[PDB]
Amino acid sequence: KSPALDAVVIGAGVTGIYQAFLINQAGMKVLGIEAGEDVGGTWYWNRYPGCRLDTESYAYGYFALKGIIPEWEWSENFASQPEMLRYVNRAADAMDVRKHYRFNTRVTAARYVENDRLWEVTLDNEEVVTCRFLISATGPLSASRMPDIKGIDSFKGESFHSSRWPTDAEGAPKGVDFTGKRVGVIGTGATGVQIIPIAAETAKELYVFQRTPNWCTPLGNSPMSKEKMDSLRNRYPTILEYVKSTDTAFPYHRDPRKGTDVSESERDAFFEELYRQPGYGIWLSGFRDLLLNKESNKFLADFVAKKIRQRVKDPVVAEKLIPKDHPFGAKRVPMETNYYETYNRDNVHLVDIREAPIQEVTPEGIKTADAAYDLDVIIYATGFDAVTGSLDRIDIRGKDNVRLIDAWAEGPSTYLGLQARGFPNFFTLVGPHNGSTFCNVGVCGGLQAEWVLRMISYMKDNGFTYSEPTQAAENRWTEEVYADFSRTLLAEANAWWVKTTTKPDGSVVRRTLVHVSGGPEYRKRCEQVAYNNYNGFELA
Ligand X SMILES: NC(=O)c1ccc[n+]([C@@H]2O[C@H](COP(=O)([O-])OP(=O)(O)OC[C@H]3O[C@@H](n4cnc5c(N)ncnc54)[C@H](OP(=O)(O)O)[C@@H]3O)[C@@H](O)[C@H]2O)c1
Dihedral of alpha carbons 453, 457, 460, 464, sign: negative
Choose, by CB under 6 A, the member of 32, 61, 189, 251 that binds ligand X.
189
Distance from C-alpha of 475 to C-alpha of 473, rounded to nearest angstrom: 5
Residues 6+ apart with CB under 8 A from 71: none
CA separation, residue 458 to residues 23, 255, 539 (Å)? 12, 39, 11
Asked if residues 484 and 495 have their Cβ atoms less than 8 Å apart, the reply is no
Q: How many CA atoms lie within 13 A of 455 on its CB side?
A: 32
| Window 278 to 337, contacts with ligand FAD (CB under 6 A) | none
By beta-carbon proximity to ligand X, the closer residue of 152 and 539 is 152
User: How far is Cα 424 from Cα 303, in angstroms, rounded to an integer?
Assistant: 49
Residue 56 lies near ligand X (rule: CB under 6 A): no
Nearest approach in angstroms of CB 141 to ligand X is 5
Q: Does 54 bind ligand X (CB under 6 A)?
A: yes
CB of 139 to ligand FAD, least distance (A): 2
The reply to whether 5 sits near ligand FAD by the rule CB under 6 A is no
Query: Measured between alpha carbons, how far is residue 452 from residues 7, 63, 135, 420, 486 in Å?
Result: 11, 18, 9, 14, 28
Q: Minimum distance from CB of 213 to ligand X (Å)?
A: 8
- Answer yes or no whether residue 394 interacts with ligand FAD by CB under 6 A: yes
* Residue 110 interacts with ligand FAD (CB under 6 A): yes or no: no
Q: From the list 77, 142, 342, 465, which residue makes contact with ligand FAD (rule: CB under 6 A)?
A: 142
Give the DSSP per-residue string, 308-364. HHHH-S-HHHHHHHS-SSS-TTSSPPPEESSTGGGGGSTTEEEEETTTS-EEEE-SS
Residue in 8, 10, 118, 381 binding ligand FAD, rule: CB under 6 A? 10
Binding of residue 383 to ligand FAD (CB under 6 A): no
Q: Determine if 376 is a binding residue for ligand X (CB under 6 A).
A: no
Q: Which of 187, 259, 329, 519 binds ligand X (CB under 6 A)?
A: 187
Interacting span for ligand FAD (CB under 6 A) from 36-44, 110-118, 398-406, 502-510: 36-44
The region, left, alpha or beta by phi > 0 then psi within -120 to 50, assigned to residue 336 is beta
From the list ligand X, ligand FAD, none, partner contacted by residue 350 (C-beta under 5 to 8 A by kind): none
Alpha-carbon span 390 to 449, nearest angstrom: 18
Tell the smallest beta-carbon distance from residue 185 to ligand FAD (Å).
15
Does residue number 431 form part of the binding site for ligand FAD (CB under 6 A)? no
We find the least distance from the C-beta atom of residue 96 to ligand FAD, in angstroms, to be 18
Told to check if 324 binds ligand X by CB under 6 A, we report: no
**190: contact with ligand X by CB under 6 A:** yes
Cβ proximity to ligand X: between 332 and 525 the closer is 332
Beta partners for 167? Answer: 173
- What is the rounded CA–CA span in Å between residue 388 and residue 386? 6
Contact 440, 243 (CB under 8 A): yes
DSSP assignment letter at 202: H
What are the residue ranges of helices labelled H in 55-141? Answer: 57-60, 62-65, 81-94
Residue 36 binds to ligand FAD (criterion: CB under 6 A): yes
**Identity of the residue numbered 196:** I
**Closest separation in Å from C-beta 133 to ligand X:** 28
Q: Which does 536 bind (CB under 5 to 8 A by kind): ligand FAD, ligand X, none?
A: none
Q: Which does 10 bind (CB under 5 to 8 A by kind): ligand FAD, ligand X, none?
A: ligand FAD
Q: Shortest distance, CB of residue 438 to ligand X, whole angstroms?
A: 9
Q: How many residues bind ligand X (CB under 6 A)?
A: 23
Closer CB to ligand FAD, residue 221 or residue 465?
221
Question: Under the phi-then-psi rule, with left for phi > 0, alpha for psi from -120 to 50, and beta for the rest, what region is 128?
Answer: beta
Residue 212 binds which entry of ligand X, ligand FAD, none, CB below 5-8 Å type-dependent:
ligand X
Q: Residue 12: which of ligand X, ligand FAD, none does it interact with, CB under 5 to 8 A by kind?
A: ligand FAD
Calculated CA dihedral for residues 323, 328, 329, 332, nearest 10 degrees: 0
Q: Candidates 210, 221, 285, 390: give the one binding ligand FAD (CB under 6 A).
A: 390
The residue (of 35 and 243) whose beta carbon lies closer to ligand FAD is 35
For residues 304 and 449, give the distance between their C-alpha atoms in angstroms, rounded to a whole number: 37
Q: Partners of 423 in the beta sheet?
A: 420
State the Cα–Cα distance between residues 195 and 381, nearest whole angstrom: 9
For the chain, what's the residue count? 540
157 near ligand X, judged by CB under 6 A:
no
Residues 319, 350 contacting (CB under 8 angstroms)? no
* 382 binds ligand X, rule: CB under 6 A: yes
CB 418 within 8 A of CB 539: no
Which of ligand X, ligand FAD, none has residue 5 at its interface (CB below 5 to 8 Å by kind)?
A: none
389 is an interface residue for ligand X by CB under 6 A: no
| Site of interaction with ligand X (CB under 6 A) | 52-54, 141, 147-149, 186-192, 194, 211-212, 332, 335, 381-384
| Site of interaction with ligand FAD (CB under 6 A) | 10-16, 33-36, 41-42, 46, 51, 53-55, 60, 106-107, 137-142, 390, 394, 430, 439-442, 445
